[PDB]
Subunit: 310 residues, 2 copies
């Protein structure tokens, strides 16, 4: 019956909740009272009452949603003993950046980019191109950190085959296969999409350049959400010129900002976005949908859908 | 060890297989022999040998992939008794159309459409817009048939909340909630994206028009992959004019083709695609990735990832 609202919400978030769940009380932690305690089944945000409530062998707490990635000082043993499920707020930035990559890939293969050139052009009722789907294609990602892995998870759920490149070719969550930097020739030959998500180091500078491009055989699309200088701008333009690559999307450039007279801008086969991929809204706006989704599922069947903490 | 290749493959599909799996034999069904029979663990395509093989209480058949949606005349009882897993080829068209909807939505909220106007415009290092993510947003779909459901599955896996509209508000696979046509006011008020995937009938003609648009409160994006006349072109342009809607993507129009002097084309807030969303490649090209994915997973751990037939 009661949710303890320890995290503040926009008035509108609270309204959604109260009308979507007219049999639930969403109680501001200021106005709570000890008569409420055994009523609280869910907590949005960690709060001092967590301790009080768990002390009562008559509490009914079932789900705590914390609003930061850190679960350290939480009474882990009590929560497990009482069977309380907990979720946190990780993956937010990495989720947005992954959506930007999917966006680049989908707008190309589903024909939105070509359709737009058509709409600003001849406005024919057909495109000069054949559409294709992500399902069934190969995605090669350099960087198997948190970002690489969240991109992998989404692509994989969309039916993509996902290969990742890291130092020693060790395993990583959601990637179907991983390879070491020295071991990439085969993955480069079968890739439909190559995504750079690496940090800049001295040995990954101009990593995307003539030799790399020449090892590709499916005329893949190149996407850069790493750093500008990973990619040799000149080699890139010539790889596109000789159809070694079909398309590029760069959310970072060398130099950056990309000056307005740079020839990259004038291409129809390079989509420049001004380093936006990782920009997310304010915490109030990103954290609440996490709770709203976990609570809807909790209400439906007692389980969580996002960021369940083990 | 052996796959019976009863379905033909492009020479290149066969190559991929033989090099990705150098310890497996991919045997053309013409060249098979009864010495092979108990070697065959997988069958790509249904074949007369299915019967022969299953007759031998010494066969090792484990996985049959059929290359059409129909599983009728298949020895269902034998397959179950021998523990054989089977997958088919449903959902192909519906998968592509769903990818087109995701593409429309992602290219808008991740800023690709605005980035392109910027690239053909001032080429600033910023966009006049704030990006947002699909994760956490509400998708309202009219039509809970096979297409609606495959769109629902993908959106839902991307963290969207998905509501569907059908005649009697009955349940449908993957939709979090469904409503009847007469019961849509609330869903329309909280929708971030509205997708039409209905068939044309006399009472769904100009369904997307002034009254409907006026019931929305989140300034949602409208997407039409149903039929042109579901949407009143005039009302649409005026709803966008008064910011009742943020954006539209129409893959169908009234009239269609959309004549080159139609004012819809000149808008920056409507993405016209020329009825491409449902166009898929030739069967050889759509069916093979289904087998390739189910076989990779089968090899990994004996399970299937796509279209497992119960």
């Amino acid at each position: 019956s009661l949710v303890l609202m320890a995290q503040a919400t926009k008035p509108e978030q609270l309204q959604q909740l109260q009308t979507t769940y007219p049999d639930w009380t969403f109680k501001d932690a200021a106005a709570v009272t000890a008569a409420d305690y055994d009523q609280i089944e869910v907590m949005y945000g960690n709060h001092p009452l967590l301790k009080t409530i768990l002390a009562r062998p008559t509490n009914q707490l079932k789900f705590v949603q914390v609003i930061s990635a850190g679960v350290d000082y939480l009474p882990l043993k009590a929560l497990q003993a009482a069977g309380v499920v907990v979720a946190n707020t990780s993956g937010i930035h990495a989720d947005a950046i992954s959506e930007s990559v999917l966006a680049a890939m989908l707008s190309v293969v589903r024909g939105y980019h070509a359709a737009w050139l058509n709409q600003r052009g001849a406005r024919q009722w057909a495109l000069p191109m054949t559409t294709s789907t992500l399902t069934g294609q190969q995605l090669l990602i350099y960087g198997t950190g948190q970002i690489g892995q969240s991109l992998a998870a989404k692509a994989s759920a969309l039916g993509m085959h996902v290969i990742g490149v890291n130092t020693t070719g060790h395993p990583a969550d959601h990637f179907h296969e991983t390879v070491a930097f020295t071991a990439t020739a085969d993955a480069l030959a079968t890739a439909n999409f190559i995504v750079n998500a690496l940090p800049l180091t001295p040995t990954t500078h101009h990593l995307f350049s003539t030799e790399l491009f020449q090892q590709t055989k499916q005329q893949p699309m190149l996407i850069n959400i790493g750093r500008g200088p990973a990619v040799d701008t000149t080699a890139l333009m010539t790889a596109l010129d000789h159809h070694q690559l079909s398309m590029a999307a760069l959310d970072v450039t060398e130099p950056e900002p990309l000056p307005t007279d740079h020839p990259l801008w004038q291409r129809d086969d390079v989509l420049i976005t001004p380093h936006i991929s990782g920009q997310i809204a304010h915490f109030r706006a990103t954290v609440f949908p996490i709770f709203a989704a976990n609570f809807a599922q909790f209400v439906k069947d007692g389980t969580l859908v996002r960021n369940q903490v083990d």
